[model samples]
Target chain A: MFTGSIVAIVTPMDEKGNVCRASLKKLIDYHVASGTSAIVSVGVTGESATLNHDEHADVVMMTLDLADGRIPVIAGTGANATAEAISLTQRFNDSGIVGCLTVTPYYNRPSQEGLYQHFKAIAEHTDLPQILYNVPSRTGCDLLPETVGRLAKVKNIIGIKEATGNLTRVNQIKELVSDDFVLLSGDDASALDFMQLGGHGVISVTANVAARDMAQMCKLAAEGHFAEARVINQRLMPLHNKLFVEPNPIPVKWACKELGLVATDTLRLPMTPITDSGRETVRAALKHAGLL
Target chain B: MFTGSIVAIVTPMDEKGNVCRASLKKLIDYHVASGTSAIVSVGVTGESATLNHDEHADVVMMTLDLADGRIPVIAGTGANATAEAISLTQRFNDSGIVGCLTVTPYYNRPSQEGLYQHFKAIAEHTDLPQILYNVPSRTGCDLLPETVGRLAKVKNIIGIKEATGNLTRVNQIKELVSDDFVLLSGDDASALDFMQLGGHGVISVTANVAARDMAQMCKLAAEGHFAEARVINQRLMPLHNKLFVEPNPIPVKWACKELGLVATDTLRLPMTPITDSGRETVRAALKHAGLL
Candidate 1:
């Protein structure tokens, strides 16, 4: 359902908080130009929760428009409320997005069974393949490897975006599930390490800043070109580390704006712009990577 | 503002999902009889996020009606957006609640300064006291001890409910802030250990199941009666550990229903009913405590 350098594309909001359609296209072209294999719009990095229903759909539609079927576009349609998630996923599925990335419910920490039921219900809603996203750190609910294995049996439930950062669990998921069940790393800082543990690719936050390099690394690792991937991973390690100097997309958005890729660096409430120390860390990492 | 055994009292939900007003009143009287020092209504345990705005306000009003000002009532008025939180805080302040418990922005992880500014802005809006809630495990944001100390100086910012389960940091907050900056433990499992490290009391989940015993434990611990508190703590340990066998208020709400304290075991969607294993653990703990 998801694989190969899926950039969790950040939503560009103007100073007035309106989604910038022009910048959205510019971002899509940047990804394609930089060789990003897939794009995940309205995912957490895109600030899905804060977006209203219409904006959420619009972001998904805009992403599809910009991609122009050049590469796959996966819509972020997950919600804590199962009914809402179903509605969003169905809409995106009908919109012709390649796949849907459904995150485990956040805040409302559901049981493992509840999670299984929630995802299973959403999976039944659409014919498009579904990729489950498991970021326990944000969701307060870990989609256990065992549960992922269970859902892997459902038709159209094709893969998982594992962000728990536990590489052993990734290996375990790989061992238990079918080889067809793609394991995508949801974190960028440890994407290389996760790939070494048999992950297929990364749905990345850092990709927002270092798309071409991330694509190269993901492709190399996916093709078992570890030596080349390792070199690129080492080269980009500093930037990867600093991108999360604060919570994701904060520093990356700042970098994008600083690089003149976007008009404004503003994030919607309650996320503030990067702190001075955070900016300094990101600046140093960018300079070290020769991006500055 | 919130310095004692503040019960984040459950909002009794019927089988059909309607809030049961009678059961809410009975739960309130149960707390009053058990000597709970304060009551917090419409907090997370009350399932505030799923409740409609009018229902949210209605639960708060109902809590105030039942308490009759017998003890202070702190309303949970937090949201990921600043304006919404400020507006809710304003309403709660006008309603004559003693304080507002503002949780760190969940989902949209703000920067530390964003968090500081968010709370500061909320504090500036109301003359009523404010208790900062730092449950990073639930909210993707963590309100560091340093940040809590900074908010402590704000005019009406009176205390914090520290739920990180890092007891050493509780001591760090004690060291940094004034005596009047009340440090209350948010986790029932670690509340005793937290109290030993200068935490005043707990804003607890277990209190819903073991109210009188928890109150005794808090009172003894607060009065330097560690010997007596330890005895009660030993008996209550199983209950505390078991109640959170699921993510909070799951086993608690079930146990409340079993004891006839509430009418139904229903929880809002996203937070489903406890699993059988969870129920077994709670039952065993209750049996050991002679409460089954």
Candidate 2:
């Protein structure tokens, strides 16, 4: 279920931090029109940590509303608390979302066995399709390939968003699990390299700003168009680096607003608005990409 | 204020997770007997994140109760929200602790500017002395040396716990800030190297299980007894590596129980008990340190 260019779409926010439904709808339409294949709503790029439980659920529902089954809506329903994650996963599953992207517990830093139990608990409790996210850089814990393979045996746990940035593990995971276990790249800078190493595609950040090119690159790579995909990746590399010039949504929000795809560049507190220097870097990169 | 062998003391827990007052008193008596210079209570090692606001405040109060003003107690009062940090800092400052060890915002992944503002807000709102904790591997954000120097100039903003394991930044930070702006090492593996690079001392994890040896090693290093300190470090190295064999408190709690220092080896849920293999590692390491 995890293949091609899936944008970690930012939850559009008004000046007052409210989820802007109109802005979210426009952003959704923009992603659809721009050739993005899937939409991952309220994941880290969507500021999952700061969103209240209700706001988190609403964003998932809103994305499903706008997507209207055009592309799969992968709701970010993971929580450090297993009970909470199960509740949220079931909520999104009931909302008719196609899949769930669950992050490893963040602050708690659970052991590998604990992580296995946590995810297996969710999978057993819900029938929804699930994509495991292994971003140890952010989560302080890695869902090791052995653990991933174990989780892969569960009926619902079918894929992983591998952001460990270790291509070797990607190869190992792909070998360990069946081809049906979708291995999507969770990093933008390494997505092309990951595909070169047999990754199916990326759950992307740069796709929010450069959805058309990212989708084209992933498609070309999936078709074994390595030379052409390399060229597209080289062209898009500046945007990939710049999208993370700040944390995911901060720069993505700025880029979307600059591109007139979103109404405002506001971000929640604890994640301040991008600084002037950050804006300067993004502007320079956009100019290099001929988007300015 | 952040200089010297600062101990991030362990909170001894009963089987039910209540703070074991008798075990805590024994730990305090042990540190005082070992010549440990300062105590940091309720830090990550002290299980701050799981402690509620009342339990957090209570731990600070207990540290002061046990110490009885024999040494400075740097209270662990940091939070992701600025207002919460300020309130916690003020409450601890009112408790007559010598200072506050405010960890960088975790899980939120604030930008450099956002971190600056977050700490700056806390510093401005309270008269309590502040020691910044930068464990970026867990926090997903580094409070860079430049930011430390910037915050150093603020009134009562004193020092930093450099846990990035980059000893090079010690010299870099020392050059920019005054010698009085304390530079403490938070990583135990690099503490001696950090001191050699002009750091003051360490806020240690190893100290929870190896207090006397860690304190003596730091003392000898501070006195330019490098060879002696290295000998002691070699003896304690297994314990240092084993304490973190799982997360901070897991193996450390096991070590304490082995030492007869605590009644229970339990940790809060989400932080499971150490596996038997991990416990055996700690047991052998303690024997290596002559604690058996």
- List the TM values for chain B, per candidate: 0.96, 0.97
Candidate 2 global TM-score: 0.86
TM per candidate comes to 0.91, 0.86
**Candidate 2 lDDT, tens digit per residue, B1-292?**
4667888888889988879999988888888888788899998888875677788789879878988877778888877656567777877656788888998876668888888888988888777888888987887778888988888889778888899999889988888898788889989988998987778899998887788898888888888888889998888888877888887778888888888888888766557888989988989999999999
TM-score of chain A of 1: 0.97
- Candidate 1: list runs displaced more than 4 Å: A87-93, A288-290, B49-55, B66-71, B90-93, B288-290
Task: Give lDDT: candidate 2, residue B124.
Answer: 82
Candidate 2 residue-wise lDDT, A118-151, digit = tens: 8988888888898999888787788899988888
Per-residue lDDT tens digits for candidate 1, residues B1-292, read 3665778888889987778988988898898898888888878888876676678888999888888877678888887778778878767667868888889888777777888888988889889888888888787778888887888889788888888898888878887788888889888788998998888889988788778888888889989888899888788789878887886667888999999999998876666788888889999988766677
- Candidate topping TM-score: 1
For candidate 1, write residues A1-292 as lDDT tens digits.
Answer: 3678989999988997668888788888899899998998898889786676788898889889878988788988888768678877777656778888899887767888888888988888889888999888787778888999999999889999988878887888887799889989987778898988888889988788789888889888988889999888887888878887887778888988877778988777677778889888988887876678
